[PDB]
Amino acid sequence: TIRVFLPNKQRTVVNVRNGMSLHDCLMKALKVRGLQPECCAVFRLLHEHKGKKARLDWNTDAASLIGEELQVDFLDHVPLTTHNFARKTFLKLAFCDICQKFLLNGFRCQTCGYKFHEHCSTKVPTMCVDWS
Amino acid sequence: MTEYKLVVVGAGGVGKSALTIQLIQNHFVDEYDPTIEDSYRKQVVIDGETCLLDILDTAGQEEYSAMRDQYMRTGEGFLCVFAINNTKSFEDIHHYREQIKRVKDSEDVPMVLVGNKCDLPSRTVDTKQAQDLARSYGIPFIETSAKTRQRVEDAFYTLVREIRQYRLKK
Ligand SMILES: Nc1nc2c(ncn2[C@@H]2O[C@H](COP(=O)(O)OP(=O)(O)NP(=O)(O)O)[C@@H](O)[C@H]2O)c(=O)[nH]1
Ligand SMILES: [Mg+2]
Ligand SMILES: [Zn+2]
Ligand SMILES: [Zn+2]
């Protein structure tokens, strides 16, 4: 097995089959957490003073990393972050971005502007997309 | 933003991972991938409050090491899941109850009994059996179905309210 730390204070433990790349081991774990491998990179955690982690190719055989501890992190300057929800009364006519129904008293992300009902909160995408 | 550290425990194949992924993704995992250790984080709104759920999906038969006793110590609420078509999984609920009460060395640990796979017609655990076990514990009981997403939000939101009421001890 290999312990892999994932973005946003998450983690998972994957089984090691010889020949299976790191991409194929972490594909399901990333998709379930609303993450894409195209925006991430896998690192091998070092345990010294000079450097915390070393980048690995997504096609690296996971069998060559048994006994190590991996960490998946976002690439540099990716337009992904966490939402910042806040209560809002929509005086101007607004509709929920999930069910396309009338939204009078709901919630809104102060960054991306995602507006939704209370009972629609689970269907909101996990990652906040901000392209300025 | 307040945080709630939830722990999902139960026997193997009862649908612990299917209920969690259904909550944070609205997607039903049809395959069986046995869990080892998976931590998830999702922002939801429960009773008009922005909550940060930190869900820890555990394994069916987990190693009785210091790792298992550690997440039970830092867990604030526990979801006890059993399959209604698996009587042995319902019998294992008693062990999880007493195990959580011993590692935390306290009572009134927020807990919810969850009967999963209620969409199947081959029911072997009667609803009366689970309600009698839940009432003797003082914890709510909920029948869920990760396939059709029936009362999946009700299972986790109930556990969060149990933690809110437990945090008001003063
Ligand atoms: N019909 C039906 N099948 C379900 C339901 N929930 C889970 N399953 C099925 O049950 C199987 C096992 O599910 P899973 O979530 O992996 O169980 P688990 O408790 O996490 N097992 P483990 O502890 O080994 O990781 C899967 O094939 C899944 O599709 C449900 O509500 N209805
Ligand atoms: Mg599982
Ligand atoms: Zn946002
Ligand atoms: Zn809505």
mmCIF file of C-alpha atoms and ligand atoms in Angstrom:
data_model
loop_
_atom_site.group_PDB
_atom_site.id
_atom_site.type_symbol
_atom_site.label_atom_id
_atom_site.label_comp_id
_atom_site.label_asym_id
_atom_site.label_seq_id
_atom_site.Cartn_x
_atom_site.Cartn_y
_atom_site.Cartn_z
ATOM 1 C CA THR A 1 0.000 0.000 0.000
ATOM 2 C CA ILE A 2 0.917 3.680 -0.425
ATOM 3 C CA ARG A 3 -0.436 6.652 1.534
ATOM 4 C CA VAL A 4 -1.194 9.563 -0.811
ATOM 5 C CA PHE A 5 -2.049 13.045 0.452
ATOM 6 C CA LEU A 6 -4.501 14.918 -1.771
ATOM 7 C CA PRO A 7 -5.258 18.642 -2.200
ATOM 8 C CA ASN A 8 -7.463 20.499 0.286
ATOM 9 C CA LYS A 9 -6.400 18.556 3.397
ATOM 10 C CA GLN A 10 -7.517 15.184 2.011
ATOM 11 C CA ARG A 11 -5.791 11.817 1.731
ATOM 12 C CA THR A 12 -6.240 8.251 0.527
ATOM 13 C CA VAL A 13 -4.469 4.889 0.667
ATOM 14 C CA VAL A 14 -4.159 2.928 -2.576
ATOM 15 C CA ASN A 15 -3.177 -0.657 -3.285
ATOM 16 C CA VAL A 16 -0.004 -1.275 -5.284
ATOM 17 C CA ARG A 17 -0.115 -3.478 -8.377
ATOM 18 C CA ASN A 18 3.191 -3.865 -10.206
ATOM 19 C CA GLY A 19 3.249 -2.019 -13.518
ATOM 20 C CA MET A 20 0.290 0.233 -12.696
ATOM 21 C CA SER A 21 1.141 3.903 -13.146
ATOM 22 C CA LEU A 22 0.478 6.511 -10.477
ATOM 23 C CA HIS A 23 -2.167 8.051 -12.745
ATOM 24 C CA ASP A 24 -4.205 4.834 -12.843
ATOM 25 C CA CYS A 25 -3.930 4.360 -9.064
ATOM 26 C CA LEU A 26 -5.181 7.863 -8.196
ATOM 27 C CA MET A 27 -7.623 8.436 -11.082
ATOM 28 C CA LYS A 28 -10.750 7.393 -9.177
ATOM 29 C CA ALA A 29 -9.670 9.118 -5.953
ATOM 30 C CA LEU A 30 -9.185 12.419 -7.792
ATOM 31 C CA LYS A 31 -12.421 12.239 -9.799
ATOM 32 C CA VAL A 32 -14.508 11.539 -6.683
ATOM 33 C CA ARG A 33 -13.069 14.651 -4.998
ATOM 34 C CA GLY A 34 -13.873 16.901 -7.968
ATOM 35 C CA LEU A 35 -10.221 17.016 -9.035
ATOM 36 C CA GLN A 36 -8.618 16.451 -12.420
ATOM 37 C CA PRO A 37 -5.144 14.984 -13.059
ATOM 38 C CA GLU A 38 -4.599 17.672 -15.721
ATOM 39 C CA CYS A 39 -4.408 20.316 -12.986
ATOM 40 C CA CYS A 40 -2.309 18.301 -10.530
ATOM 41 C CA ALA A 41 1.133 16.761 -10.069
ATOM 42 C CA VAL A 42 2.223 13.872 -7.842
ATOM 43 C CA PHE A 43 5.222 14.281 -5.532
ATOM 44 C CA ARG A 44 7.342 11.969 -3.389
ATOM 45 C CA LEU A 45 7.680 13.327 0.145
ATOM 46 C CA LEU A 46 11.287 13.710 1.269
ATOM 47 C CA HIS A 47 12.232 13.529 4.951
ATOM 48 C CA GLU A 48 15.271 15.806 5.177
ATOM 49 C CA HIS A 49 15.971 19.542 5.380
ATOM 50 C CA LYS A 50 16.791 20.378 1.738
ATOM 51 C CA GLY A 51 13.469 20.018 -0.060
ATOM 52 C CA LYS A 52 10.069 18.768 1.091
ATOM 53 C CA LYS A 53 8.941 16.810 -1.980
ATOM 54 C CA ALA A 54 10.188 15.749 -5.414
ATOM 55 C CA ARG A 55 7.947 15.698 -8.474
ATOM 56 C CA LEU A 56 7.233 12.380 -10.192
ATOM 57 C CA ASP A 57 5.837 11.628 -13.630
ATOM 58 C CA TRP A 58 2.216 10.472 -13.689
ATOM 59 C CA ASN A 59 3.310 7.359 -15.626
ATOM 60 C CA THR A 60 5.772 6.204 -12.948
ATOM 61 C CA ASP A 61 5.223 2.612 -11.843
ATOM 62 C CA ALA A 62 3.658 2.661 -8.376
ATOM 63 C CA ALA A 63 5.601 -0.496 -7.468
ATOM 64 C CA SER A 64 8.841 1.529 -7.448
ATOM 65 C CA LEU A 65 7.411 3.735 -4.665
ATOM 66 C CA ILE A 66 6.459 1.137 -2.042
ATOM 67 C CA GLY A 67 7.517 2.328 1.393
ATOM 68 C CA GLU A 68 7.315 5.971 0.280
ATOM 69 C CA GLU A 69 4.696 8.625 1.019
ATOM 70 C CA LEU A 70 3.236 10.548 -1.913
ATOM 71 C CA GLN A 71 1.486 13.909 -2.146
ATOM 72 C CA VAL A 72 -0.712 15.227 -4.965
ATOM 73 C CA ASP A 73 -0.780 19.017 -5.286
ATOM 74 C CA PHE A 74 -2.200 21.587 -7.669
ATOM 75 C CA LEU A 75 -0.017 22.957 -10.438
ATOM 76 C CA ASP A 76 1.303 26.510 -10.269
ATOM 77 C CA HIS A 77 -1.261 29.327 -10.593
ATOM 78 C CA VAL A 78 -4.172 27.005 -11.400
ATOM 79 C CA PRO A 79 -7.559 28.840 -11.300
ATOM 80 C CA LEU A 80 -8.871 26.566 -8.536
ATOM 81 C CA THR A 81 -9.577 27.391 -4.897
ATOM 82 C CA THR A 82 -12.208 26.829 -2.208
ATOM 83 C CA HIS A 83 -15.621 28.478 -2.187
ATOM 84 C CA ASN A 84 -16.580 31.261 0.238
ATOM 85 C CA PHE A 85 -20.313 30.919 0.863
ATOM 86 C CA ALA A 86 -22.474 33.657 2.365
ATOM 87 C CA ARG A 87 -26.183 34.229 2.922
ATOM 88 C CA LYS A 88 -27.870 36.548 0.441
ATOM 89 C CA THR A 89 -31.363 37.843 -0.306
ATOM 90 C CA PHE A 90 -31.673 38.228 -4.081
ATOM 91 C CA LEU A 91 -33.555 41.472 -4.679
ATOM 92 C CA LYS A 92 -32.776 41.304 -8.397
ATOM 93 C CA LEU A 93 -34.442 38.262 -9.954
ATOM 94 C CA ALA A 94 -32.159 35.250 -9.559
ATOM 95 C CA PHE A 95 -32.474 31.520 -10.196
ATOM 96 C CA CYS A 96 -30.628 28.638 -8.570
ATOM 97 C CA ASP A 97 -27.646 27.452 -10.611
ATOM 98 C CA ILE A 98 -28.494 23.819 -9.736
ATOM 99 C CA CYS A 99 -32.252 23.400 -10.268
ATOM 100 C CA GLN A 100 -32.969 26.565 -12.329
ATOM 101 C CA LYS A 101 -35.769 27.536 -9.935
ATOM 102 C CA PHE A 102 -36.683 30.821 -8.274
ATOM 103 C CA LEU A 103 -34.065 31.781 -5.673
ATOM 104 C CA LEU A 104 -35.241 34.350 -3.112
ATOM 105 C CA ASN A 105 -33.282 33.446 0.050
ATOM 106 C CA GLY A 106 -30.223 31.333 -0.688
ATOM 107 C CA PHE A 107 -26.429 31.391 -0.671
ATOM 108 C CA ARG A 108 -23.709 32.741 -2.936
ATOM 109 C CA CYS A 109 -19.957 32.299 -3.283
ATOM 110 C CA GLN A 110 -18.244 35.660 -2.810
ATOM 111 C CA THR A 111 -15.615 34.656 -5.408
ATOM 112 C CA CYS A 112 -17.254 32.858 -8.351
ATOM 113 C CA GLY A 113 -20.846 33.952 -7.700
ATOM 114 C CA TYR A 114 -22.378 30.469 -7.544
ATOM 115 C CA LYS A 115 -25.932 30.938 -6.233
ATOM 116 C CA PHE A 116 -27.979 28.023 -4.927
ATOM 117 C CA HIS A 117 -30.718 26.859 -2.578
ATOM 118 C CA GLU A 118 -30.047 25.395 0.856
ATOM 119 C CA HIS A 119 -31.056 21.880 -0.237
ATOM 120 C CA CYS A 120 -28.998 22.226 -3.449
ATOM 121 C CA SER A 121 -25.698 22.732 -1.600
ATOM 122 C CA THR A 122 -24.408 19.187 -2.166
ATOM 123 C CA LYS A 123 -24.665 19.518 -5.964
ATOM 124 C CA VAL A 124 -22.424 22.616 -5.962
ATOM 125 C CA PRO A 125 -19.046 21.814 -7.586
ATOM 126 C CA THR A 126 -16.340 21.174 -5.011
ATOM 127 C CA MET A 127 -13.701 23.446 -6.570
ATOM 128 C CA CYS A 128 -14.090 27.194 -7.084
ATOM 129 C CA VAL A 129 -13.116 28.396 -10.569
ATOM 130 C CA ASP A 130 -11.852 31.986 -10.807
ATOM 131 C CA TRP A 131 -10.457 33.330 -14.077
ATOM 132 C CA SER A 132 -10.210 36.924 -12.793
ATOM 133 C CA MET B 1 -16.698 28.460 9.274
ATOM 134 C CA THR B 2 -17.393 25.614 11.692
ATOM 135 C CA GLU B 3 -16.089 22.129 10.903
ATOM 136 C CA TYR B 4 -17.531 18.686 11.649
ATOM 137 C CA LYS B 5 -15.279 15.609 11.591
ATOM 138 C CA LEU B 6 -17.487 12.660 10.633
ATOM 139 C CA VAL B 7 -16.440 9.001 10.677
ATOM 140 C CA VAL B 8 -18.232 6.285 8.687
ATOM 141 C CA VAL B 9 -17.892 2.815 10.220
ATOM 142 C CA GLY B 10 -19.451 -0.533 9.444
ATOM 143 C CA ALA B 11 -18.909 -3.974 8.009
ATOM 144 C CA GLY B 12 -17.469 -4.581 4.564
ATOM 145 C CA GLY B 13 -19.697 -4.080 1.549
ATOM 146 C CA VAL B 14 -22.509 -2.333 3.444
ATOM 147 C CA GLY B 15 -22.186 0.801 1.303
ATOM 148 C CA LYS B 16 -20.036 3.138 3.392
ATOM 149 C CA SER B 17 -18.166 4.461 0.353
ATOM 150 C CA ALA B 18 -21.307 4.575 -1.797
ATOM 151 C CA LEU B 19 -23.138 6.744 0.746
ATOM 152 C CA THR B 20 -20.196 9.139 1.101
ATOM 153 C CA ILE B 21 -19.556 9.562 -2.628
ATOM 154 C CA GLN B 22 -23.299 9.966 -3.214
ATOM 155 C CA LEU B 23 -23.311 12.847 -0.720
ATOM 156 C CA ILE B 24 -20.359 14.812 -2.124
ATOM 157 C CA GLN B 25 -20.845 13.954 -5.821
ATOM 158 C CA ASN B 26 -24.450 12.767 -6.404
ATOM 159 C CA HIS B 27 -22.876 9.786 -8.184
ATOM 160 C CA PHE B 28 -23.580 6.134 -7.357
ATOM 161 C CA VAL B 29 -20.467 3.947 -7.429
ATOM 162 C CA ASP B 30 -21.696 0.648 -8.864
ATOM 163 C CA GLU B 31 -18.394 -1.225 -8.547
ATOM 164 C CA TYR B 32 -16.942 -2.654 -5.328
ATOM 165 C CA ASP B 33 -13.579 -1.091 -4.452
ATOM 166 C CA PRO B 34 -12.692 -2.152 -0.882
ATOM 167 C CA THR B 35 -11.586 0.885 1.102
ATOM 168 C CA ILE B 36 -8.378 1.182 3.102
ATOM 169 C CA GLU B 37 -8.509 4.833 4.230
ATOM 170 C CA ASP B 38 -10.165 7.796 2.489
ATOM 171 C CA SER B 39 -10.650 11.353 3.756
ATOM 172 C CA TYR B 40 -13.074 13.742 2.046
ATOM 173 C CA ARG B 41 -13.922 17.411 2.569
ATOM 174 C CA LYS B 42 -17.092 19.080 1.299
ATOM 175 C CA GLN B 43 -18.829 22.375 2.072
ATOM 176 C CA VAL B 44 -22.581 22.032 2.646
ATOM 177 C CA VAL B 45 -25.360 24.132 4.164
ATOM 178 C CA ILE B 46 -27.237 22.550 7.078
ATOM 179 C CA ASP B 47 -30.084 24.550 8.659
ATOM 180 C CA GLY B 48 -28.855 27.788 7.093
ATOM 181 C CA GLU B 49 -25.271 27.353 8.341
ATOM 182 C CA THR B 50 -22.217 26.918 6.119
ATOM 183 C CA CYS B 51 -20.709 23.652 7.374
ATOM 184 C CA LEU B 52 -17.365 22.096 6.424
ATOM 185 C CA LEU B 53 -17.758 18.312 6.548
ATOM 186 C CA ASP B 54 -14.576 16.277 7.054
ATOM 187 C CA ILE B 55 -15.714 12.725 6.296
ATOM 188 C CA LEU B 56 -13.418 9.745 6.893
ATOM 189 C CA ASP B 57 -14.397 6.567 5.051
ATOM 190 C CA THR B 58 -13.047 3.539 6.923
ATOM 191 C CA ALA B 59 -12.454 -0.072 5.920
ATOM 192 C CA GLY B 60 -14.712 -3.019 6.670
ATOM 193 C CA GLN B 61 -12.111 -5.043 8.578
ATOM 194 C CA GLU B 62 -9.590 -2.402 9.626
ATOM 195 C CA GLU B 63 -6.255 -3.142 11.275
ATOM 196 C CA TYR B 64 -6.440 -2.819 15.069
ATOM 197 C CA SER B 65 -3.364 -0.598 15.200
ATOM 198 C CA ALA B 66 -2.768 2.864 16.654
ATOM 199 C CA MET B 67 -4.133 4.304 13.397
ATOM 200 C CA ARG B 68 -7.640 2.987 14.071
ATOM 201 C CA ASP B 69 -7.709 4.200 17.681
ATOM 202 C CA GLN B 70 -6.426 7.595 16.508
ATOM 203 C CA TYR B 71 -9.181 8.569 14.068
ATOM 204 C CA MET B 72 -11.831 7.478 16.572
ATOM 205 C CA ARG B 73 -10.257 9.871 19.092
ATOM 206 C CA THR B 74 -10.317 12.854 16.708
ATOM 207 C CA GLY B 75 -13.723 11.973 15.244
ATOM 208 C CA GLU B 76 -16.673 14.040 16.440
ATOM 209 C CA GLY B 77 -19.560 12.047 14.953
ATOM 210 C CA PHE B 78 -19.917 8.444 13.862
ATOM 211 C CA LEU B 79 -22.156 6.999 11.152
ATOM 212 C CA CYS B 80 -22.878 3.310 11.820
ATOM 213 C CA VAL B 81 -23.881 1.737 8.501
ATOM 214 C CA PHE B 82 -25.255 -1.767 7.979
ATOM 215 C CA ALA B 83 -26.923 -3.432 5.006
ATOM 216 C CA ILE B 84 -30.525 -4.548 5.438
ATOM 217 C CA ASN B 85 -29.839 -7.646 3.305
ATOM 218 C CA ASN B 86 -26.809 -8.593 5.455
ATOM 219 C CA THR B 87 -27.893 -9.708 8.927
ATOM 220 C CA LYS B 88 -24.290 -10.230 10.051
ATOM 221 C CA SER B 89 -23.528 -6.576 9.275
ATOM 222 C CA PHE B 90 -26.394 -5.526 11.555
ATOM 223 C CA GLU B 91 -25.041 -7.743 14.345
ATOM 224 C CA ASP B 92 -21.649 -6.012 14.080
ATOM 225 C CA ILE B 93 -23.269 -2.650 14.905
ATOM 226 C CA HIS B 94 -23.166 -3.497 18.617
ATOM 227 C CA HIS B 95 -19.377 -3.870 18.566
ATOM 228 C CA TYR B 96 -18.835 -0.504 16.866
ATOM 229 C CA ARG B 97 -21.043 1.169 19.482
ATOM 230 C CA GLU B 98 -19.064 -0.143 22.460
ATOM 231 C CA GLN B 99 -15.729 0.380 20.689
ATOM 232 C CA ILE B 100 -16.335 4.099 20.118
ATOM 233 C CA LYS B 101 -17.475 4.568 23.725
ATOM 234 C CA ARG B 102 -14.247 2.985 25.021
ATOM 235 C CA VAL B 103 -11.672 4.811 22.879
ATOM 236 C CA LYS B 104 -13.193 8.222 23.639
ATOM 237 C CA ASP B 105 -13.779 7.261 27.308
ATOM 238 C CA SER B 106 -17.124 9.061 27.403
ATOM 239 C CA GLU B 107 -20.851 8.729 26.750
ATOM 240 C CA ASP B 108 -23.290 10.650 24.525
ATOM 241 C CA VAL B 109 -20.959 10.288 21.527
ATOM 242 C CA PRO B 110 -22.959 11.598 18.527
ATOM 243 C CA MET B 111 -24.009 8.530 16.568
ATOM 244 C CA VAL B 112 -26.532 7.584 13.875
ATOM 245 C CA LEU B 113 -27.682 4.103 12.851
ATOM 246 C CA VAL B 114 -27.972 3.784 9.064
ATOM 247 C CA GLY B 115 -29.690 0.929 7.247
ATOM 248 C CA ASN B 116 -28.413 0.960 3.677
ATOM 249 C CA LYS B 117 -29.565 -0.795 0.486
ATOM 250 C CA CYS B 118 -33.278 -0.291 1.158
ATOM 251 C CA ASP B 119 -33.938 -0.408 -2.604
ATOM 252 C CA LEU B 120 -33.294 -4.158 -2.713
ATOM 253 C CA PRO B 121 -36.324 -6.436 -2.190
ATOM 254 C CA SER B 122 -34.364 -9.150 -0.330
ATOM 255 C CA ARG B 123 -34.663 -7.634 3.129
ATOM 256 C CA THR B 124 -33.299 -9.810 5.940
ATOM 257 C CA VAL B 125 -33.077 -7.226 8.763
ATOM 258 C CA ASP B 126 -36.505 -6.021 9.857
ATOM 259 C CA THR B 127 -37.023 -2.318 10.507
ATOM 260 C CA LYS B 128 -38.330 -3.123 13.997
ATOM 261 C CA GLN B 129 -34.991 -4.747 14.857
ATOM 262 C CA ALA B 130 -33.020 -1.611 13.981
ATOM 263 C CA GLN B 131 -35.399 0.817 15.699
ATOM 264 C CA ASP B 132 -35.255 -1.277 18.881
ATOM 265 C CA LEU B 133 -31.451 -1.227 18.770
ATOM 266 C CA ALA B 134 -31.369 2.514 18.064
ATOM 267 C CA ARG B 135 -33.892 3.443 20.762
ATOM 268 C CA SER B 136 -31.940 1.488 23.384
ATOM 269 C CA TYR B 137 -28.880 3.532 22.356
ATOM 270 C CA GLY B 138 -30.664 6.887 22.215
ATOM 271 C CA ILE B 139 -29.504 7.502 18.634
ATOM 272 C CA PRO B 140 -31.580 8.158 15.487
ATOM 273 C CA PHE B 141 -32.112 5.432 12.898
ATOM 274 C CA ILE B 142 -32.415 6.111 9.161
ATOM 275 C CA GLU B 143 -32.974 3.807 6.181
ATOM 276 C CA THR B 144 -30.889 4.886 3.189
ATOM 277 C CA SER B 145 -30.262 3.824 -0.401
ATOM 278 C CA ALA B 146 -27.048 4.989 -2.057
ATOM 279 C CA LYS B 147 -28.314 3.704 -5.420
ATOM 280 C CA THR B 148 -31.405 5.936 -5.611
ATOM 281 C CA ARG B 149 -30.092 8.551 -3.125
ATOM 282 C CA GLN B 150 -32.861 8.060 -0.565
ATOM 283 C CA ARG B 151 -32.350 9.935 2.722
ATOM 284 C CA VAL B 152 -28.604 10.149 2.058
ATOM 285 C CA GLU B 153 -28.504 13.820 3.033
ATOM 286 C CA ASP B 154 -30.794 12.986 5.963
ATOM 287 C CA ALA B 155 -28.237 10.513 7.334
ATOM 288 C CA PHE B 156 -25.311 12.949 7.361
ATOM 289 C CA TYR B 157 -27.313 16.061 8.277
ATOM 290 C CA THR B 158 -28.805 14.221 11.263
ATOM 291 C CA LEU B 159 -25.311 13.351 12.500
ATOM 292 C CA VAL B 160 -24.260 16.996 12.156
ATOM 293 C CA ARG B 161 -27.241 18.170 14.212
ATOM 294 C CA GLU B 162 -26.322 15.564 16.834
ATOM 295 C CA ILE B 163 -22.866 17.155 17.043
ATOM 296 C CA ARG B 164 -24.336 20.666 17.247
ATOM 297 C CA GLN B 165 -26.553 19.694 20.184
ATOM 298 C CA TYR B 166 -23.631 17.867 21.815
ATOM 299 C CA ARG B 167 -21.406 20.948 21.479
ATOM 300 C CA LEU B 168 -23.953 22.997 23.477
ATOM 301 C CA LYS B 169 -23.055 21.225 26.751
ATOM 302 C CA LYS B 170 -22.470 24.069 29.218
HETATM 303 N N1 LIG C 1 -28.464 -1.885 -4.579
HETATM 304 C C1 LIG C 1 -27.608 -1.185 -3.830
HETATM 305 N N2 LIG C 1 -26.306 -1.461 -3.885
HETATM 306 C C2 LIG C 1 -25.575 -0.671 -3.078
HETATM 307 C C3 LIG C 1 -26.013 0.337 -2.245
HETATM 308 N N3 LIG C 1 -24.945 0.913 -1.578
HETATM 309 C C4 LIG C 1 -23.896 0.255 -2.014
HETATM 310 N N4 LIG C 1 -24.210 -0.718 -2.926
HETATM 311 C C5 LIG C 1 -23.280 -1.628 -3.608
HETATM 312 O O1 LIG C 1 -22.603 -2.388 -2.628
HETATM 313 C C6 LIG C 1 -21.260 -2.678 -3.081
HETATM 314 C C7 LIG C 1 -20.269 -2.292 -2.011
HETATM 315 O O2 LIG C 1 -20.336 -0.868 -1.788
HETATM 316 P P1 LIG C 1 -19.274 0.023 -1.004
HETATM 317 O O3 LIG C 1 -19.714 1.430 -0.911
HETATM 318 O O4 LIG C 1 -17.929 -0.186 -1.702
HETATM 319 O O5 LIG C 1 -19.168 -0.653 0.434
HETATM 320 P P2 LIG C 1 -18.204 -0.410 1.679
HETATM 321 O O6 LIG C 1 -18.938 -0.334 2.942
HETATM 322 O O7 LIG C 1 -17.475 0.985 1.432
HETATM 323 N N5 LIG C 1 -17.076 -1.584 1.693
HETATM 324 P P3 LIG C 1 -15.532 -1.530 2.207
HETATM 325 O O8 LIG C 1 -15.529 -1.337 3.780
HETATM 326 O O9 LIG C 1 -14.833 -2.918 1.871
HETATM 327 O O10 LIG C 1 -14.763 -0.451 1.592
HETATM 328 C C8 LIG C 1 -21.090 -1.967 -4.426
HETATM 329 O O11 LIG C 1 -21.262 -2.875 -5.508
HETATM 330 C C9 LIG C 1 -22.194 -0.906 -4.398
HETATM 331 O O12 LIG C 1 -22.654 -0.588 -5.707
HETATM 332 C C10 LIG C 1 -27.411 0.620 -2.196
HETATM 333 O O13 LIG C 1 -27.977 1.472 -1.511
HETATM 334 N N6 LIG C 1 -28.137 -0.203 -3.034
HETATM 335 MG MG MG C 2 -15.577 1.344 1.231
HETATM 336 ZN ZN ZN C 3 -16.846 29.840 -5.756
HETATM 337 ZN ZN ZN C 4 -31.881 24.998 -6.246
#
